[PDB]
Amino acid sequence: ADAKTVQDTVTQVIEQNMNGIDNLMYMSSNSDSTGTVQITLTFESGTDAD
Amino acid sequence: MPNFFIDRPIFAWVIAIIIMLAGGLAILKLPVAQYPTIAPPAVTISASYPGADAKTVQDTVTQVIEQNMNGIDNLMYMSSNSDSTGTVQITLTFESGTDADIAQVQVQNKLQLAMPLLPQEVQQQGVSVEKSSSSFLMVVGVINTDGTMTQEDISDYVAANMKDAISRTSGVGDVQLFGSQYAMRIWMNPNELNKFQLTPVDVITAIKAQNAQVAAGQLGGTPPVKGQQLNASIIAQTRLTSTEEFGKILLKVNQDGSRVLLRDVAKIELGGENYDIIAEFNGQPASGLGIKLATGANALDTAAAIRAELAKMEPFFPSGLKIVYPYDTTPFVKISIHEVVKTLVEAIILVFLVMYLFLQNFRATLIPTIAVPVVLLGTFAVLAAFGFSINTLTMFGMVLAIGLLVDDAIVVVENVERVMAEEGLPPKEATRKSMGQIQGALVGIAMVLSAVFVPMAFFGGSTGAIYRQFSITIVSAMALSVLVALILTPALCATMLKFGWFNRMFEKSTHHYTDSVGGILRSTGRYLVLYLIIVVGMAYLFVRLPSSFLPDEDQGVFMTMVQLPAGATQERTQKVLNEVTHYYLTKEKNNVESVFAVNGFGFAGRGQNTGIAFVSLKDWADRPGEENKVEAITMRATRAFSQIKDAMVFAFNLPAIVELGTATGFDFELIDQAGLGHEKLTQARNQLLAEAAKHPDMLTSVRPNGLEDTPQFKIDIDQEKAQALGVSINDINTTLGAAWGGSYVNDFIDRGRVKKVYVMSEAKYRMLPDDIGDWYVRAADGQMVPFSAFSSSRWEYGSPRLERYNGLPSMEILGQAAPGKSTGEAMELMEQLASKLPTGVGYDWTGMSYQERLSGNQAPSLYAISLIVVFLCLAALYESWSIPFSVMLVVPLGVIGALLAATFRGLTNDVYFQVGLLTTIGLSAKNAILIVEFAKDLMDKEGKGLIEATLDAVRMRLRPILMTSLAFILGVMPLVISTGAGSGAQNAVGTGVMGGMVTATVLAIFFVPVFFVVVRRRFSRK
C-alpha cells in the first residue's frame, strides 16, 4: 500500500548516507511498489569488496 | 658506476627523465590536506532520551550500552559522558594504526546487542556510531539578511534542498547540518486540555492511529481465481502531510456532536526538532553545514567544487538566502604551497648567484639547476609510493631538506672545477678522477644520513606520526639525491664543463685561512679545550631551552568562550553573545570579518548556560601589523571581556592541528575504583584539587574539566495515593513527561521527505515549579486529578554531567606543568598527591598524558642506536675503529648556535626545531667525512703528510663549504625567519637551521681539520 512512500521513506534516507565510502563509482537504487527496495553501490575495480 | 655513466651520459638522462616523469604524474595523484592523520583513531557513541538527566541517563543507557564493549579488538581506552539533556557520548580511542573502518564495525556491531536493553525512548532516536573528528575542512554558513527565515526555516532549506547536493561531490567525506529539519510540533496546554478531560496520552495515542501507514494487498498477485484480469494495488491509510491535516484530529467527542480536535487542545506548526542551541551569524539567523575532508581527496580541489556546487544553486528560493563561508581551511593551505615552492625555486636562484661568484662559468651553474628540480620532483613519487600526501608537514619536510640536496649537487660540480684546475685534465678525465674522489664518500654519507634521520618515525602516537612525515620526506629526498649525484650529475658536469672584488679577494683569504689554521696545530689539544666548553655549553642551553610540539599560528579564525553561571539561560546567555559579537564587530571592525556565535555548545557541557562564539577575521593582507594579528586580537578581547557581569568570557587562538594533543599540559582522570558514590568522589576530588594549589612550585592550574552539582527540582509520585485515586502510575508519567520534556510521537511526510513529529506543552505552562499544578490526569472513574493529590516536591542537588572512565564512575581534571618544570615531572607530583586520597579512589592518566607516559621519552634510546650505526657505517667508510671518531665530534658544533634559538630569539625545542637540528647535523658531519676523506686519500694514496695532508685537505675544501653554506643561509633567511602571516613554522624551521648552520661551518673549518689531527696520532702513537 505505498506508491512513492517507500522511496523517500527508506530509499532516500539509506541513500542520503551512502556518501563517504571510498572507491564508489556509482550508486543506483530502484524503489518498488511491493515495498521492496534495492540500493546498490559499485566500486572502482580492484577495490576490496569486504 | 658513474665512470661507466660519464661515458654514456646519453643514458643517464633517460634515468633522469623517467624520475621526472614519475615525480610529475605523482604530483597529480597526490592528495592535499592541511595536515595528515595523526590522532589515534577514535569512535563516539551518541544517544538521546528527550527529558533526562545524568542518573536517568547513566543508568539507563551509558552503562548498559558500555557493559558490552567487550570483544572489540585493539581498544586503548573508552571514556564516556552522561549530561543533563539526554545526550550520551561514549567515544573509544583505539591502538595506533588499527583500521578505523574495522573498529567502527565491532564497536558498532556490538551496540547491536545491548539495544535490546536500551529504553524505547532511546532506541527510537537511535544510538549512532562514527569516527571521531569534530572540526574539519570547510563550514559553509547559510544566513538570511532580511528577517524572513528563522533558525529553523533556514535549517530546513539547507536540509531539504542543498545538504545532499553537496554531500555527493568529489571530496565531501561527510556533511553535518547546523540545525534540524522541520518537525511536526504539537504544543499542548493543560488548561484547554483539562477542560475536555483529555491528557497528553489521549493526544499522543491519536497522533498515532490518525497518522500512520497501513497495509492492504494487491487484487490478483497472491493466488487468484481462474481467468482474472485486473491486478492492482490497494492504497489504504497513509500519513498526514500538513499542519492542516494535523489540526484536524478527533481527540474527543461527547453528547453534543462535540468535535474536540487536536487543533483545540494545543497548537500545531512546523518547527525545529531540538530547540536549545540558537545559531546565528553576525546577529543574523543562521544554519550552516560542516564538511569534512574525504580521505584521499584534495583539500583544494574539493573546496573549489563545494564552492562550485553552492554556486549554480544559489539562484534559488525568495528572501535572500546568502551562503557564507565563515571557515575554509584552504586559503591557508595554498599560501603555504605558494611559499615553500618559492623557498625551493629561490633556493636555487641562490645556487645560481652563489657558485657563479666562485666558479667563473655559466654552463656550471646550469648543473645544480638541472639537478635540484630533478631531485625534488621524484621525491614527489616516493611520497606517492608510501601513500603519503602534500600536507604542511610533508612540505616543510623538503624545505628543511632543500639544503642537503642542493649541497650534494654543488659538492660534485665543484670537485671537477678543481681537478680540471689544480693542474688537471679536460672535462672527462676530470670527472673520472674528481667524481671518484668523493664517490665512496657520497655513498657512505648516504648510510650515515640514513641514520640520524631514520630513527624518527619510530616515536610515539599522536606525534611521531608527525615525525614520520618529516623523516621519510627527508630521507627520500636525501638518499634520492645521492643517487643522482652518482648518476646524472657526474655525466652532466662532464659534457657541459669547460669580479676582481673576489677570486682576487679569495685565492689569498683561502691561503691566509689555511695558513692561519696552519700551525695552531702543533700543541694539537690547543682548542681541544675551548671546544669542550662549547659542548659543556650546549648541555647548558639544552636544558634551559623550553619545549613544545608545534608553534601555534594565525589562522582564518579563533573563538571566544562565554559561560553564564550555574543555572543560567539561553536568553541571559544570548545577550552575552550579542556583546561578544559587538566588542568584535565595532571595536575590531577592520579585522573581525564575522562572528559565528552559538549558545548551547559549551566546551564542557551544554545547556542554556554556556555558549561559544567563533570569529572569522579579514585576510592576513588587510591585517598588516602584529597588532592586527590573532595572537594579538585575542589579547584585547580576553581582557576587554573581563569587566563583564557574571559571565566568564574567554578568547583564545586554536592550536595548529585542531584535532590532536593540545598544550604540553596534562589530562588526568580520578577513578571511583569502587562503591564510593558521586559524592565520595567529589570530596575525593576536592581533596587533591586543593592539595594541588598548595604547590604552585610544581606549577599548576589543576582544574576539574566537569560541572558542579547544581540544584534540581524533584517530583515524587505517591504510589499509594495514586492507587487510591483511579490513577495509573503510567498515565502520570507520560503526562508529566511529554508535558515538560516532550515525546516524539511518530513520523509524517512533508514535501516528499519524512520528518519527525514531536508533541509537548506550550512553553507558557512549563517554566516554574508552580505550573506543575496546571497539569491534570484522567483517572479510572474519569475525574481529572492534580499533582498534589498524588505527589510531593522538594529541591536538591544532583550532577548535570556525570563523567566516567573506562566503564567506571569518573571525573576529569586537567592542568599545566610549571613555568620552570617538565610536563613529566609535573605529572609525578599530581600522582603523589593522588597517592594519599581516600581508599576507594583510583587515578588514571589519559589523552596526551597517555602517550607521553607510555612512550614519551625515547629520543635517547633511539639516537643511541643511530650514533652507533653512524660509527659503524662510518668506520667502514675509512678502515678503523677510531678514525670515524674524527667525524662525529662535529655534532656539538652545529648543535650550539642552533640552540641560539634561546639566546638570540624567543623560541622552544619544538618539532620543527629538532627536525632542522637534524638537517644541520647532516651537512656538518657530511663536511667532516669529506675533509676527513681528503685527509687520508692523499695521505694514504700519496703517503703525504701525517699533518701536511690535513692542511692541503682543508685547502681543497674551504670552497665547497663556503659555497654551499652560503646559498643555504641566504636561502633560509627570507620570509623564512622574517615573516608576517601564514608562517609560524616558517620562523620555526629557519631560525633553527639559520644559526647552528653558521656555527657548523664558521666553527668546523677549524675543528674538523683538528679533531682529525688530535687523533690519527692518539692511535698507533709512540
Name chain A contacts of B174, Cβ cutoff 8 Å: 19-20
Name chain A contacts of B173, Cβ cutoff 8 Å: 20
Cell of B508: 689569498
Read off the amino acid at residue B707.
L
Distance from CA of B226 to the nearest CA of A (A): 23
Of B235, B295, B752, the CB nearest to A22: B295
Chain B interface disruption, residue of A6, A17, A22, most B CBs within 10 A: A22
Which one is the CATH code of B710-798: 3.30.2090.10, 3.90.1150.10, 3.40.50.620, 3.90.1070.10?
3.30.2090.10
Q: In CATH, what number does B180-275 get?
A: 3.30.2090.10
Report how far residue A30's alpha carbon sits from residue A36's, in angstroms, rounded to the nearest whole number. Answer: 9
B403 vs B216, B400, B409, B882, B907, CA distance in Å? 78, 7, 10, 29, 22
In B, minimum Cα distance to A27 occurs at B168
* Closest residue by Cα to residue B76 from B43, B51, B52, B102: B43
**Alpha-carbon B417 to chain mean position:** 49
Name chain B contacts of A3, Cβ cutoff 8 Å: 235
Beta-carbon contacts of B432 under 8 Å, excluding residues fewer than 6 positions away, are B3, B6, B494
Q: For chain B, give every residue range classified as CATH 3.30.2090.10.
A: 180-275, 710-798
Report how far residue B550's alpha carbon sits from residue B572's, in angstroms, rounded to the nearest whole number. Answer: 38
Contact A1 B216 (CB under 8 A): yes
State the DSSP code for B482: H
CATH class of residue range B38-132+799-806: alpha beta
In A, minimum Cα distance to B102 occurs at A50
Of A8, A19, A22, the CB nearest to B754: A8
Written as one string, the DSSP assignment of B307-349 is: HHHHHHHSS-SSS-EEEE-S-BSSHHHHHHHHHHHHHHHHHHH
Report how far residue B615's alpha carbon sits from residue B649's, in angstroms, rounded to the nearest whole number. Answer: 14
B711 by DSSP, 3-state: which? strand
Cβ(B639)–Cβ(B809) below 8 Å: no
B573 by DSSP, 3-state: which? helix
CATH class of residue range B133-179+276-328: alpha beta
Distance from CA of A28 to the nearest CA of B (A): 13
Of B173, B235, B754, the CB nearest to A9: B754
In A, minimum Cα distance to B237 occurs at A1
Report how far residue B656's alpha carbon sits from residue B630's, in angstroms, rounded to the nearest whole number. Answer: 13
Q: For chain B, give every residue range classified as CATH 3.30.70.1440.
A: 660-709+807-853
Contact A1 B172 (CB under 8 A): no
**What phi, psi does B610 have (nearest 5°)?**
-90, 160
Name chain B contacts of A20, Cβ cutoff 8 Å: 173-174, 294-295
Distance from CA of A12 to the nearest CA of B (A): 8
Contact B749 A13 (CB under 8 A): no
Written as one string, the DSSP assignment of B402-432 is: HHHHHHHHHHHHHHHHHHTTSS---HHHHHH
B191 by DSSP, 3-state: which? helix
A32 by DSSP, 3-state: which? coil
- Interruptions in chain B after residues (C–N over 2.5 Å): 498
| Geometric angle at alpha carbon B472, from B467 and B476, rounded to 5° | 150
**Alpha-carbon B634 to chain mean position:** 21
Distance from CA of B236 to the nearest CA of A (A): 6
Contact B167 A5 (CB under 8 A): no
Report how far residue B114's alpha carbon sits from residue B68's, in angstroms, rounded to the nearest whole number. Answer: 7
- Strand B808-815 relative to strand B703-704, pairing: antiparallel
Cell of B858: 625515547
Distance from CA of A8 to the nearest CA of B (A): 6
Which one is the CATH code of B555-659: 3.40.50.720, 3.30.70.2970, 3.30.1490.150, 3.30.70.1430?
3.30.70.1430
**Cα dihedral sign for B193, B194, B195, B198?**
positive
Contact A1 B295 (CB under 8 A): no
Contact A1 B235 (CB under 8 A): yes
Determine whether B39 is exposed, middle or buried from the number of CB atoms within 10 Å of its CB (0-12, 13-18, 19+). middle
B783 by DSSP, 3-state: which? coil
Chain B interface disruption, residue of A19, A28, A29, most B CBs within 10 A: A19
Contact A16 B164 (CB under 8 A): yes
Distance from CA of B312 to the nearest CA of A (A): 21
Cβ(B805)–Cβ(B677) below 8 Å: no
Experimental method: X-ray
- Strand A37-38 relative to strand A30-31, pairing: antiparallel
The superfamily (CATH) of domain B1-37+329-498 is Multidrug efflux transporter AcrB transmembrane domain (1.20.1640.10)
B377 vs B176, B371, B382, B474, B644, CA distance in Å? 38, 10, 9, 13, 56
**Alpha helix locations (H) across B58-119?**
63-65, 100-114
**Alpha helix locations (H) across B563-629?**
570-582
Number of residue pairs across A and B with CB atoms under 8 Å?
39
In A, minimum Cα distance to B162 occurs at A16
Cα diameter, chain B: 129
In A, minimum Cα distance to B166 occurs at A19
- Strand B592-601 relative to strand B808-815, pairing: unpaired
Q: In CATH, what number does B499-554+854-1022 get?
A: 1.20.1640.10
Cβ(B114)–Cβ(B67) below 8 Å: yes
Read off the amino acid at residue B297.
A
Contact A8 B175 (CB under 8 A): no
Q: For chain B, give every residue range classified as CATH 3.30.70.1430.
A: 38-132+799-806, 555-659
Contact B296 A16 (CB under 8 A): no
Cell of B892: 656539538
**Alpha-carbon B140 to chain mean position:** 20
Instruction: Region of A20 please: left (phi>0), alpha (psi -120 to 50) or beta.
Output: left
Name chain B contacts of A22, Cβ cutoff 8 Å: 295-296
Q: Can you state the percent helix, strand and coil of chain B, rounding each to 5?
A: 45, 15, 45
**Has domain B660-709+807-853 been given CATH number 3.30.70.1440?**
yes
Distance from CA of A21 to the nearest CA of B (A): 8
* Closest residue by Cα to residue B610 from B566, B557, B653: B566
In A, minimum Cα distance to B235 occurs at A1
Distance from CA of B689 to the nearest CA of A (A): 44
In A, minimum Cα distance to B160 occurs at A16
B668 by DSSP, 3-state: which? strand
Q: For chain B, give every residue range classified as CATH 1.20.1640.10.
A: 1-37+329-498, 499-554+854-1022
Contact B213 A5 (CB under 8 A): yes
Torsion over CA of B768, B772, B773 and B779, rounded to 10 degrees? 170
Beta-carbon contacts of A34 under 8 Å, excluding residues fewer than 6 positions away, are none
User: Using beta carbons and an 8 Å cutoff, which residues of B are at the interface with A?
Assistant: 164, 167-168, 172-175, 213-216, 233-236, 238, 294-296, 749, 752-754
Cβ(B1008)–Cβ(B928) below 8 Å: yes
Of B214, B294, B754, the CB nearest to A1: B214
Distance from CA of A34 to the nearest CA of B (A): 9
Torsion over CA of B529, B535, B536 and B540, rounded to 10 degrees? 150
- Strand B138-144 relative to strand B266-269, pairing: unpaired
Contact B213 A13 (CB under 8 A): no
In A, minimum Cα distance to B222 occurs at A34
Name chain B contacts of A6, Cβ cutoff 8 Å: none
Contact B752 A8 (CB under 8 A): yes
Contact B753 A12 (CB under 8 A): yes
Read off the amino acid at residue B686.
N
Contact B172 A19 (CB under 8 A): yes
